Amino acid sequence: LKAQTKTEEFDAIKIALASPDMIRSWSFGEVKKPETINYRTFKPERDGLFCARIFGPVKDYECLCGKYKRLKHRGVICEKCGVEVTQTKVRRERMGHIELASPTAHIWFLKSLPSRIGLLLDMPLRDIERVLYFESYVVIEGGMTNLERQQILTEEQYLDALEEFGDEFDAKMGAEAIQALLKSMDLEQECEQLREELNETNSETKRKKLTKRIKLLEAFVQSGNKPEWMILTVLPVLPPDLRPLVPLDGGRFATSDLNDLYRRVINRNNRLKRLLDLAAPDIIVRNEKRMLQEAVDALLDNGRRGRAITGSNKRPLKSLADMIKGKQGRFRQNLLGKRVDYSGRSVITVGPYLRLHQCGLPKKMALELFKPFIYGKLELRGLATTIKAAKKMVEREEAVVWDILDEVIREHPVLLNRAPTLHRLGIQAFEPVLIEGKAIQLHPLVCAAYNADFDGDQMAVHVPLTLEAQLEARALMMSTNNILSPANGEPIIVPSQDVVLGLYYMTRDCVNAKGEGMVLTGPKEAERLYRSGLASLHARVKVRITEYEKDANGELVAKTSLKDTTVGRAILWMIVPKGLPYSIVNQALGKKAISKMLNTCYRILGLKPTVIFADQIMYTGFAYAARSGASVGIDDMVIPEKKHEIISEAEAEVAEIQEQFQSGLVTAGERYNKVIDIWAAANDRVSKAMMDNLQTETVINRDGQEEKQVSFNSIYMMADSGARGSAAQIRQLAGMRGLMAKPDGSIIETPITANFREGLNVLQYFISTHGARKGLADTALKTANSGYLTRRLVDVAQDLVVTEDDCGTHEGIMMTPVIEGGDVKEPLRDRVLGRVTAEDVLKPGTADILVPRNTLLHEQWCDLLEENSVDAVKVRSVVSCDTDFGVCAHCYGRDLARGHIINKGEAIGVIAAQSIGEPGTQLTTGGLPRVADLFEARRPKEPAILAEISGIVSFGKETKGKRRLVITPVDGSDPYEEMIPKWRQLNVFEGERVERGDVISDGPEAPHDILRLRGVHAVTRYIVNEVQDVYRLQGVKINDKHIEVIVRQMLRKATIVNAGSSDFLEGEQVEYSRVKIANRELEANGKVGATYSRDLLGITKASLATESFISAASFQETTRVLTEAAVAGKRDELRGLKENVIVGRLIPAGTGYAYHQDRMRRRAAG
Amino acid sequence: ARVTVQDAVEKIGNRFDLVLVAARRARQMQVGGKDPLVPEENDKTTVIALREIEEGLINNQILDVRERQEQQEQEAAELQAVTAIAEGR
Amino acid sequence: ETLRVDPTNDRLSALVEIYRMMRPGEPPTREAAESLFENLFFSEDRYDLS
Amino acid sequence: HARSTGSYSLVTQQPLGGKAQFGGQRFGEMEVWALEAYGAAYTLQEMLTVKSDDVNGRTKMYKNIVDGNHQMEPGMPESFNVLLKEIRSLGINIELEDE
Amino acid sequence: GRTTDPVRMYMREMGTVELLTREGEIDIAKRIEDGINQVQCSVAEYPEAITYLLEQYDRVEAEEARLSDLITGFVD
Ligand SMILES: [Mg+2]
Ligand SMILES: [Zn+2]
Ligand SMILES: [Zn+2]
């Protein structure tokens, strides 16, 4: 079967050097003229940069001369001036060329950092350029006389050598010379010779270089490029509509700078032809060749020579290289962004009446957005005669069409997005609800995920046009379908502030009120009791309730009892569906507990009940918060009655120490520390005074004289419930606020003795100012840093997607509680939850299999684990997965917005990166830079060293900057001898044995070491635990999984040690290697298998390694990537995400996985 | 509307392939070659398809079998038409 | 020591290095070195601290 | 602000408001990553092809939108198509292999 | 050295060439006269170079050409 010829749908792409003939293939004519347009009739001047004959008609299906104007005549080339009449779009397509008189270097291959022509010819750059400028003569094919082949002579030397050597000696100069070198070059001969030379001499200096060069040469052979190609004979011209001359207002014109450049090249070239035909002296024609080289170089990539300036304008003219590069990056225009139809934006407002599955959409906006749909529907029913008339109807805004829009809106979700998109939840899909007004209404419960306040934040809407986009929006991007953070299984739909103050005020108990101690049949008459004013919202009461438990087998058990609770809890219980116990609502319901309620509800009753539950919780929260009449007054903030006294005593301390300094008893510095310490203590005193007073000081009467309970004071309830405020800010409101520091960071020894409730004075405020500005600047900067980190992260991962289902390995990491120094800084439960057991675990007794090998440990399995005392669970990690080029779902974990195991095809690397990066603003050596350092694998500043090998050690030689440590293992040879600088204080015992990876000194260690001297599991544990230290210290929840996938990408590369297939020291993909040695262990050589060594590459480095050049050209240096790929003739197969986004085809993740896989298998097949 | 798709994800696993199958079916209905397998509530083809997934009367297998049958239905018609094309000889 | 690192000797010897520092690549001249140097910080035209 | 189908930019065909008829919302890299984390391929393809960069795709789509058929026949975005000419304008030959 | 910027690699290259002496201009000019006149005389000694001119003038008065496309004037 003929495969095909004309346009199929392509796969891969290929890049290479271009032939004079191949360049001529694209060219439909030679531009012989600098002229553009006629200057009156603006028609293109034939034949020039803008030409109808070479390129195309100026207007659709119309000849230039005007003879053939009819759409009937198409493939006709007009007799007058040949122009085939065809759409004017082709003027945006067709190429052309220019035949250069003298050969010309392609500046991309001359100035690329490892100069291509230069290291191909094994010639230095300066020599090559020197020759190019006609400043020296260079030998070519020297024959046997006196002279080296690449040797460079001068005027006198060339003349002398010529007088001696006649023929059988050859030298040229300028571009023609270099081209002669490249053309004369035989790669094959060099190959043979170099292999031999490699073989004979043993020196590292010789053979390293030798081997690198021969490999380079064979790589360039394999191609298909040949050397002469780096030198330009023919120069292609960019199609004119891509560098347009188009008119403006006032009759003015504006055009691309490429026309200036091309014009320059053409003029100088033609002038060179002239100077050749006029028989000009060498000095002149040479200058013309130099100028032409400069012109071509300026056209291709400007700035690697003189930086030509555009006409009359100082600003340097943009060149083709700059046309490719873009800027603000690192941004290739799919990357930075692209304008999109069917979309809009505006200020957002509240809309609490909404179910969380919908959003208020302004009438006008929805009208303008769904316009084509409205047209088509209108004429579908017949309300509009034709599409034209349908426009005129909606343009009239006739009364009918609103009813049609109600139809087109119903089942048809819209995408809402906010500005700082961090994690994937930054975009969510809702159902449009038509709303009067220009503002968008956004569900309160979602305000968390968006990080969207109501202070004038704006949101953007997008319409999912195609059917697949509607179903993708509804089954994936839908609001209700992500109720959980992808970072951690904890609910992101957790009620925020007003609502939690509502449920808190509802469920809390006072000591006494109306209805205290009575008895009621159930929640119904409890609410009925409250609403009529008889019983207080909160009063201690026994009521009969019926709870349910599903603890039968998939079946709900009913039970009823008398519960000691409050009227409020009783009323609220009406909302709690089915199987949940009454215990959950019987507490005080803080922002934390109110969340665990929802979480438990989800993991018990499923999605739908959790959704409707959450909705109800929000509604009742708002309503009862409004009923509550919560407020904030000036007397709501209570200053400790003991404050002034504390201030006084602490103030006496300073004067004690001051007198001591005047008496010389204490020095200056120690004194400073003392006074700073006394004030620092005073602050804690006032804080822990105001907190006692504020918290418990409601003293209230029940029956007998007195009792005291937690306060009903507003600001307290706010800070306590989790609504808003915190003990720090409350402390700053009532008690004195802090100690400040000068710009230096030297902390002022006179703290602010006044707070916000009292007035601050001039000094106190002026001193607070610096802290303020440093705060704003710092946070505004940490935004940028966070962004950078996420970027590095997704660049490092991306294409990692769940590919296979089960790789089926017993391998994994050993999961224990973190158990740090105190008790249990994080439990075993959270660490092992949602993960999959590597192997079947014991009871304390055995042949008892409680959990059998690979079973996703869901909450129940985990609680079974907790019932027994089990202290340890080996867990499959993404880092150890046997599957190549991705991760198997069975080894990943369950985690998702859904509680079920991860689906085949979801791209986990991206959401991992996003998950690590979203909280990144919250982080305050330590901090966010610590995280960056960890992921970059950077060796610390003053690191320790670990024993290279086990066995007894001892000290030898002396004081040469290093006092050597000689290691002595039991059985093995001694020879490992390391040189440790003696001016650092050691640890290791001169008379004792040390295991490999022991402390031979103190200080932080480089993870490279931890990988090498300890091992893979050790280093992944080190990374994950350290970054988790950074985050967890800040109260950030990030599952180990994501850091573990990042880690997997970090160690991706490994350097070979042994042999039998590939080269000795090559850094190479383990996936590649392991696949090749697993393939090698059988068949092939019976076993030739090659050893490797795992390598730790930092994220920014690991991102550098990519097979796809379309991808590399995105975030890397474009100019270098395209060259470096072009020489090798590198053929990009796509495969990964970035390239497919760039080329504008389906993502090979997601819904796309089905397609790409289906195609990928169809490829390399029958 | 269909507020949660969870039951649909229950029937066919992947949660993606669900979107795909539902898309195919919703297209069978939208460009009208076919009609619903479940009462139309004014639910658009999107949600009708999803409902059809929940009720287990629509998934990849079923659709494939149906299409494979229809190919042969058309073979039955053109049986006399294309055999008269023996002019290939 | 600064002097010990000084490649020059006399006034013009220094003026050459200064001129070749400011406008390098091109052949120095006596009148050129003097003109440039006197024009830099010493000219009422090209220099003012106010 | 809101837009369905407006004016387009000449140099690279992209949505451009010239009329106080607005250029649509810019869909950036992060916004793309968001679609990438979700399994939505088609939302993204239509986002960067038919809704924006594809000069055939936009209109061929629009007609289907009014016809009551939701599909896309995307083809190749004009940005990349331009980049091919820009790369090929140099001494670089970039081809589309196979089938 | 060479700062590139081809204005330099030109200026320095021509800067070698020595300014002509007044008499030297006459030397060169005389050399030119000798040189040209050689090819003029070698053309004169060619029989076909004569016959061709004859046939061409025969084409001029036969109205197949014009006097401006054959001679740019004689002396006169
Ligand atoms: Mg804000
Ligand atoms: Zn014509
Ligand atoms: Zn695995």
Tab-separated table of N, CA and C in Angstrom, chain A residues 836-887:
chain	number	residue	atom	x	y	z
A	836	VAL	N	0.045	2.266	49.539
A	836	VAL	CA	-0.141	0.847	49.285
A	836	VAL	C	0.989	0.054	49.931
A	837	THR	N	0.625	-0.958	50.710
A	837	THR	CA	1.611	-1.782	51.393
A	837	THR	C	2.506	-2.525	50.410
A	838	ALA	N	3.811	-2.447	50.644
A	838	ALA	CA	4.779	-3.160	49.826
A	838	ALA	C	4.611	-4.656	50.009
A	839	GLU	N	4.362	-5.064	51.250
A	839	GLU	CA	4.204	-6.476	51.573
A	839	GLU	C	3.277	-6.715	52.763
A	840	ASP	N	2.752	-7.935	52.848
A	840	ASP	CA	1.831	-8.313	53.915
A	840	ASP	C	2.456	-8.157	55.297
A	841	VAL	N	1.767	-7.428	56.170
A	841	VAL	CA	2.277	-7.178	57.518
A	841	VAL	C	1.734	-8.109	58.604
A	842	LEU	N	2.577	-8.377	59.594
A	842	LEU	CA	2.241	-9.215	60.743
A	842	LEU	C	1.352	-8.574	61.816
A	843	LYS	N	0.743	-9.433	62.627
A	843	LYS	CA	0.292	-9.065	63.963
A	843	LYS	C	1.532	-9.188	64.846
A	844	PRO	N	1.428	-8.806	66.147
A	844	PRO	CA	2.592	-9.209	66.939
A	844	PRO	C	2.825	-10.712	66.824
A	845	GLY	N	1.759	-11.510	66.745
A	845	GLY	CA	1.886	-12.926	66.427
A	845	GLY	C	1.864	-13.143	64.921
A	846	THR	N	2.250	-14.325	64.445
A	846	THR	CA	2.391	-14.490	62.989
A	846	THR	C	1.787	-15.729	62.287
A	847	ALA	N	2.027	-15.796	60.974
A	847	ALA	CA	1.169	-16.492	60.006
A	847	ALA	C	-0.229	-15.915	60.101
A	848	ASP	N	-0.292	-14.692	60.610
A	848	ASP	CA	-1.530	-13.953	60.716
A	848	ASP	C	-1.377	-12.774	59.770
A	849	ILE	N	-2.077	-12.827	58.645
A	849	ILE	CA	-2.018	-11.759	57.675
A	849	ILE	C	-3.248	-10.900	57.884
A	850	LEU	N	-3.004	-9.698	58.416
A	850	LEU	CA	-4.062	-8.728	58.557
A	850	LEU	C	-4.186	-7.970	57.242
A	851	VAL	N	-3.151	-7.238	56.853
A	851	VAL	CA	-3.104	-6.622	55.533
A	851	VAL	C	-2.160	-7.379	54.567
A	852	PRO	N	-2.741	-7.965	53.504
A	852	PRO	CA	-2.179	-8.877	52.496
A	852	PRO	C	-1.489	-8.242	51.279
A	853	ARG	N	-0.202	-7.925	51.400
A	853	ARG	CA	0.586	-7.401	50.282
A	853	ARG	C	0.049	-6.071	49.784
A	854	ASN	N	-0.283	-5.979	48.501
A	854	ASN	CA	-0.719	-4.689	48.000
A	854	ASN	C	-2.222	-4.526	48.135
A	855	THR	N	-2.569	-3.676	49.087
A	855	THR	CA	-3.925	-3.261	49.338
A	855	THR	C	-3.782	-1.795	49.657
A	856	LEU	N	-4.495	-0.951	48.926
A	856	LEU	CA	-4.531	0.453	49.260
A	856	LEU	C	-4.962	0.529	50.703
A	857	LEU	N	-4.202	1.228	51.532
A	857	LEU	CA	-4.632	1.305	52.908
A	857	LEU	C	-5.534	2.521	52.992
A	858	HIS	N	-6.824	2.269	53.131
A	858	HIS	CA	-7.793	3.331	53.309
A	858	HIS	C	-7.981	3.468	54.797
A	859	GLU	N	-8.797	4.434	55.203
A	859	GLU	CA	-8.919	4.825	56.606
A	859	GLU	C	-9.226	3.657	57.533
A	860	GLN	N	-10.083	2.753	57.072
A	860	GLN	CA	-10.422	1.566	57.851
A	860	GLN	C	-9.224	0.642	58.046
A	861	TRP	N	-8.543	0.298	56.954
A	861	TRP	CA	-7.334	-0.520	57.028
A	861	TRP	C	-6.324	0.104	57.993
A	862	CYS	N	-6.162	1.421	57.902
A	862	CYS	CA	-5.253	2.146	58.783
A	862	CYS	C	-5.674	2.055	60.248
A	863	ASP	N	-6.976	2.126	60.504
A	863	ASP	CA	-7.468	2.025	61.875
A	863	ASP	C	-7.335	0.611	62.432
A	864	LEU	N	-7.461	-0.389	61.563
A	864	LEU	CA	-7.195	-1.771	61.943
A	864	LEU	C	-5.740	-1.865	62.360
A	865	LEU	N	-4.870	-1.293	61.531
A	865	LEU	CA	-3.448	-1.215	61.838
A	865	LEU	C	-3.210	-0.591	63.206
A	866	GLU	N	-3.971	0.455	63.522
A	866	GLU	CA	-3.816	1.163	64.793
A	866	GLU	C	-4.373	0.382	65.989
A	867	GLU	N	-5.378	-0.455	65.741
A	867	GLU	CA	-5.956	-1.297	66.786
A	867	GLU	C	-4.879	-2.214	67.349
A	868	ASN	N	-4.252	-2.971	66.457
A	868	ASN	CA	-3.004	-3.655	66.760
A	868	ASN	C	-1.938	-2.581	66.928
A	869	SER	N	-0.805	-2.921	67.515
A	869	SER	CA	0.158	-1.890	67.895
A	869	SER	C	1.098	-1.498	66.759
A	870	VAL	N	0.804	-1.960	65.540
A	870	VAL	CA	1.807	-2.028	64.473
A	870	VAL	C	2.586	-0.720	64.306
A	871	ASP	N	3.903	-0.852	64.418
A	871	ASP	CA	4.804	0.286	64.423
A	871	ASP	C	5.434	0.576	63.063
A	872	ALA	N	5.322	-0.367	62.133
A	872	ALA	CA	6.035	-0.231	60.869
A	872	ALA	C	5.309	-0.840	59.672
A	873	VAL	N	5.289	-0.103	58.564
A	873	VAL	CA	4.698	-0.591	57.322
A	873	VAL	C	5.572	-0.252	56.115
A	874	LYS	N	6.052	-1.265	55.398
A	874	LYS	CA	6.799	-0.987	54.175
A	874	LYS	C	5.825	-0.587	53.071
A	875	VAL	N	6.116	0.536	52.420
A	875	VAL	CA	5.180	1.160	51.491
A	875	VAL	C	5.804	1.449	50.126
A	876	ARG	N	5.116	1.034	49.066
A	876	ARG	CA	5.570	1.278	47.704
A	876	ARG	C	5.594	2.774	47.409
A	877	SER	N	6.710	3.247	46.865
A	877	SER	CA	6.865	4.664	46.553
A	877	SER	C	7.095	4.870	45.066
A	878	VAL	N	6.825	6.082	44.597
A	878	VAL	CA	7.014	6.416	43.190
A	878	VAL	C	8.481	6.364	42.801
A	879	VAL	N	9.353	6.500	43.793
A	879	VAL	CA	10.787	6.542	43.545
A	879	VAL	C	11.337	5.160	43.180
A	880	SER	N	10.710	4.111	43.703
A	880	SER	CA	11.198	2.749	43.499
A	880	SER	C	10.494	1.979	42.375
A	881	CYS	N	9.519	2.610	41.726
A	881	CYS	CA	8.671	1.927	40.746
A	881	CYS	C	9.445	1.346	39.558
A	882	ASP	N	9.230	0.060	39.290
A	882	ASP	CA	9.961	-0.641	38.234
A	882	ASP	C	9.593	-0.132	36.844
A	883	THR	N	8.396	0.436	36.718
A	883	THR	CA	7.918	0.941	35.432
A	883	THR	C	8.802	2.072	34.908
A	884	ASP	N	9.100	2.013	33.614
A	884	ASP	CA	9.994	2.968	32.979
A	884	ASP	C	9.195	4.033	32.242
A	885	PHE	N	9.720	5.255	32.239
A	885	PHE	CA	9.076	6.383	31.571
A	885	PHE	C	7.700	6.682	32.162
A	886	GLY	N	7.624	6.697	33.489
A	886	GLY	CA	6.393	7.023	34.184
A	886	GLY	C	6.244	6.300	35.508
A	887	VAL	N	5.032	6.311	36.053
A	887	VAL	CA	4.741	5.693	37.342
A	887	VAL	C	3.483	4.839	37.243
